[PDB]
Design a protein around this ligand. Sequence first.
Ligand SMILES: Cc1cc2nc3c(=O)[nH]c(=O)nc-3n(C[C@H](O)[C@H](O)[C@H](O)COP(=O)(O)OP(=O)(O)OC[C@H]3O[C@@H](n4cnc5c(N)ncnc54)[C@H](O)[C@@H]3O)c2cc1C
Ligand SMILES: Cc1cc2nc3c(=O)[nH]c(=O)nc-3n(C[C@H](O)[C@H](O)[C@H](O)COP(=O)(O)OP(=O)(O)OC[C@H]3O[C@@H](n4cnc5c(N)ncnc54)[C@H](O)[C@@H]3O)c2cc1C
Ligand SMILES: N[C@@H](CCCC[NH3+])C(=O)O
Ligand SMILES: N[C@@H](CCCC[NH3+])C(=O)O
Lengths: 578, 578
Amino acid sequence: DFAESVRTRWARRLIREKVAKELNILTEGGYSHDNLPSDPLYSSIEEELPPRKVCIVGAGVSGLYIAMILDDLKIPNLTYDIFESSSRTGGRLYTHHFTDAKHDYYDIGAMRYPDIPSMKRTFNLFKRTGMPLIKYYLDGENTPQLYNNHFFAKGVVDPYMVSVANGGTVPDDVVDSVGEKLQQAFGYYKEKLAEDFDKGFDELMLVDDMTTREYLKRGGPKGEAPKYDFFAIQWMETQNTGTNLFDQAFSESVIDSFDFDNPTKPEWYCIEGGTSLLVDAMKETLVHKVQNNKRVEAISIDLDAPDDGNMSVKIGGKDYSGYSTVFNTTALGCLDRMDLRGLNLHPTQADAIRCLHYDNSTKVALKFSYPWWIKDCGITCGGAASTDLPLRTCVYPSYNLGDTGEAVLLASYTWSQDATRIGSLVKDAPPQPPKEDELVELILQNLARLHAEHMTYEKIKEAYTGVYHAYCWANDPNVGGAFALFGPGQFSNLYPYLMRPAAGGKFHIVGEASSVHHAWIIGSLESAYTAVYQFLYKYKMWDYLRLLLERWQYGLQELETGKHGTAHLQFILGSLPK
Amino acid sequence: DFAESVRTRWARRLIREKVAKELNILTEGGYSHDNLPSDPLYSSIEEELPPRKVCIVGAGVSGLYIAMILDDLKIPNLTYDIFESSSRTGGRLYTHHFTDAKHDYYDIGAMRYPDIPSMKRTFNLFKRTGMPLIKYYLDGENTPQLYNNHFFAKGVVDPYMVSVANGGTVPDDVVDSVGEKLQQAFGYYKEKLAEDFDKGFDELMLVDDMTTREYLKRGGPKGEAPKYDFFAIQWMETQNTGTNLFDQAFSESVIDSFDFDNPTKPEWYCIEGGTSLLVDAMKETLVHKVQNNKRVEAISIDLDAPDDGNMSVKIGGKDYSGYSTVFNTTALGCLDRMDLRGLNLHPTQADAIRCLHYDNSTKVALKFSYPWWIKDCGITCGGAASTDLPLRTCVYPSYNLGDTGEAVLLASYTWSQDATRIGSLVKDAPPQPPKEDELVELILQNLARLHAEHMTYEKIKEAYTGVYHAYCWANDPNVGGAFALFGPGQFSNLYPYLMRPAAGGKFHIVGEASSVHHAWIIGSLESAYTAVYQFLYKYKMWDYLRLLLERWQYGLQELETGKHGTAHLQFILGSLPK
Ligand SMILES: Cc1cc2nc3c(=O)[nH]c(=O)nc-3n(C[C@H](O)[C@H](O)[C@H](O)COP(=O)(O)OP(=O)(O)OC[C@H]3O[C@@H](n4cnc5c(N)ncnc54)[C@H](O)[C@@H]3O)c2cc1C
Ligand SMILES: Cc1cc2nc3c(=O)[nH]c(=O)nc-3n(C[C@H](O)[C@H](O)[C@H](O)COP(=O)(O)OP(=O)(O)OC[C@H]3O[C@@H](n4cnc5c(N)ncnc54)[C@H](O)[C@@H]3O)c2cc1C
Ligand SMILES: N[C@@H](CCCC[NH3+])C(=O)O
Ligand SMILES: N[C@@H](CCCC[NH3+])C(=O)O
């Protein structure tokens, strides 16, 4: 199908555009994106295998997935070490259990999974590990929305009183039509790519250098779409709770708008018991256990040594040597902090590591002695409230809908500058119990205003147990943010360098930022699968490369392999010294 | 002079553009930016004064400056309370003294002051308080610069080996000409404003909606300037250590490029003993002492009460009432966290508080048993090193140049995402002494690479005393960042609302973000002076308004007062209910 295909087609052609220019710089030529050299090695795709050992840096889901794939392939004489800087395994899969009562938790990192075709690799991993899935209610019943201290009202013009007609500055033609105006903006590029991808791709490249706000202000790479003034775009943004969208490349956002075009009523799932169940199941399966409290501070390769096992990492000032390949799966801010001089990375790959932008995210969960949002507010089916108050979005759990006693509320979920603001009130040294601090006081005050239709402040404060937990990902030194979120031009210009091997094809930058499915578990898993592919190719393990394709190829393959592919060319360009 | 005047002319006309549109919405008209109504009250500019009390929220430099002005005017029966949330007074004026030896400190907030005409109000405050000024060396001797693990070399083409000619991606025509290409970009708009401000202002408004990166990519609001590709702009950015410039409105950045056109060799000053000397001197002068540990959580006005003293604030759940005016001087993230429903602010003024962006900044200072950068590296005169390593910029103090024993180095000074990254390693619970943590280890490793021409890692580690301190402003709940840094369209569209009084002309949003001189002490001081002006006008204290103009008017006046002015019109539009 087309809507399922556009993102993979987009990624593959970005790689082709850059390979052609780089190829041309190698010989300089007539190489074009749709005319590149074929793979001279496809003619060919126990312990005749020499002993090899590989290093996996990081035990988040992508490092654990690499280990799971290697374990399943059972390559003779192949072993690995996996080093994790934190005392905790899982990375951005992170459930906080207040106690280990059934539902007494919240997820600090990933928590919901939509059932769309690009997520097949993710749901297969859930299947392999026996994850108990339940429905996640993205849209709920009776959730309040509060802006300009007015509640949303069905079938009312400008209920928040923010439009020019009511004395504000939001244009009357935008105030009640945000979702609609956004779906056109992109929708003009949806039908051009649908007519024919090659012509649509070229038209979309003229906005690849644009932010969302820039597109909406200028009306097209060509100027053929409606134009919006400052306050209209500000409102479209204010109504955007969630990850930053208006600072993303407009091209990327157009690609994103196909994601839910089977259409945007897929069901959503979460893991009963918390997403960390997945981590536990993965890490208990591994042949070689994760080594926690092992922060890599340097990675190198010794080009004077001709053997396969010529790479090393440094941990706590000690050298760990003998690796034939290193898979780095950390977020890029962590990788930028390492001493990578021993890898001789080319400058533009070094820039991608340093410059790609990460969005912040903060979560605040509070425990109440009963679920007053269910019992008193009629909020019986999950969903989320949104507001311009500091807590921005209050998420009603989908895993405790039938409980009648103590219950967790995800009272604030913020992104970007809102998350930095709440994060300033979050300390990893909790106050002396049961002192209430500034953050709790703020959240309770905001919750009472958001639920003022059915609750008082006194009644919410009375229901609060005194137990809460909060977490700000930009303040976690092992991650530095929620996830990559690429500015104008960054994806078209840097994704080719991030997907590329380095150090003679022996080093891989792996993880959600290295994939076009970035932001989600699927991006981590696909990037891991791709790195294992290139590793097997590097050492010409053709029998095991076939097994990888037969056993672990899910959904549409991001990496363009085969005969017309570019995988061999990304490998060569990453294997090239200088 | 023109170059001294452009920023004030720019600000005043932005106010006029918005007043004309709003005026027109009031009667709807023929009001234009250069045809607005005159002041009907200039015909007129002890205890015939009724007793009044005002509230100053925040004891940073702008709240202390308001109190200092009021103290000097000696208005009979006028008193004030000034409430400060922190246990510390000073705000973003913040010297950390490791001990109180002479030079044993670093400044966490403001530290250097250029002697340019727009800074006259600041140097007058230094004069009034007896500040001991010494030279601040912005450019030093022999400071290293390290990019792509190459050191800068005089008279060498592409010393960092990042250009297309040397296998990188930075265009050969940009790699060694960044400062030059930037000075043209703006320079095309410098000479249009110089020809005639009205025509230049209109041409500049066509880019007011643009970021710096957007301008450089598109080459002009008109497309008449050179255009730059992604990697050229990335490099111009990489070479930008300092506050974000490429995400500012291009208009604003053009205005900024006049700042140092007397020209850009003014001298710089710092305060010997730390900038907190200024705080101490100001706070010890006040008639009413700062009340610390008093965080305002709500501000209101009681419109049912006709008396002047009808405003209140809430602090720790207790009401403090009786105020005739409230000056809020906190950063806007703090003000957005308050319950301001009692003020009935109009939605667009509420949006400005919530949406204006703040840049992050982090500083890391280490003490060494001797100044090895002076003695061993020849870095004898201050300045700063720059690098693409995580510490980004290392600032050699200007206040310890003659010392031979223990000395402080400001080893890392970062902004934006670099500051968020270092900030993730900064905890306000210091590690158990004298354990070395991840941050110190990183800074020492980076310092040794930056100074590798004359130092070893072992020699720098040996000189380190084990004493350091670090601070990340985005993680301070009393501030939330270094300072406002306005995106595309934000200054033109929101500065008019921030300068405007509210609540019947009785509430003022004061501080560095409320001024066109924003980012600096001068912006805080000018915004404070402006708020006192509007307060005196509100209560028709014409004798004291004259004294304010005679005693406290320094430099060019930001606020357009007089007969053609707009001050009375900003007051009316802020006094209007609904
Ligand atoms: C707030 C939030 C909400 C999310 N919600 C969803 C969701 O609902 N659905 C979804 O599908 N995805 C979601 N995601 C995305 C998903 O969680 C991530 O894409 C994925 O978990 C990232 O995994 P990774 O292995 O690529 O990286 P990581 O999880 O970051 O793992 C990298 C590991 O490397 C370790 N490390 C770092 N430095 C070093 C070092 N020097 N030495 C050794 N180890 C090191 C880190 O400690 C970490 O364990 C969310 C993410 C966030 C932040
Ligand atoms: C890293 C950095 C470097 C700088 N360098 C320079 C420089 O070299 N030169 C220069 O001229 N300027 C510099 N500045 C800018 C200058 O420091 C600021 O412009 C100025 O100090 C801001 O003062 P203010 O009074 O506007 O705000 P603030 O200093 O933020 O003061 C506001 C006060 O309000 C308090 N407060 C907050 N919330 C509440 C509440 N709810 N109730 C009561 N009180 C509250 C805060 O604690 C604070 O004390 C720098 C700033 C930073 C961050
Ligand atoms: N995947 C994450 C983040 C999505 C928002 C990205 N800007 C979630 O489900 O919340
Ligand atoms: N005024 C501050 C910040 C300037 C950079 C602004 N982006 C200083 O001297 O460092």
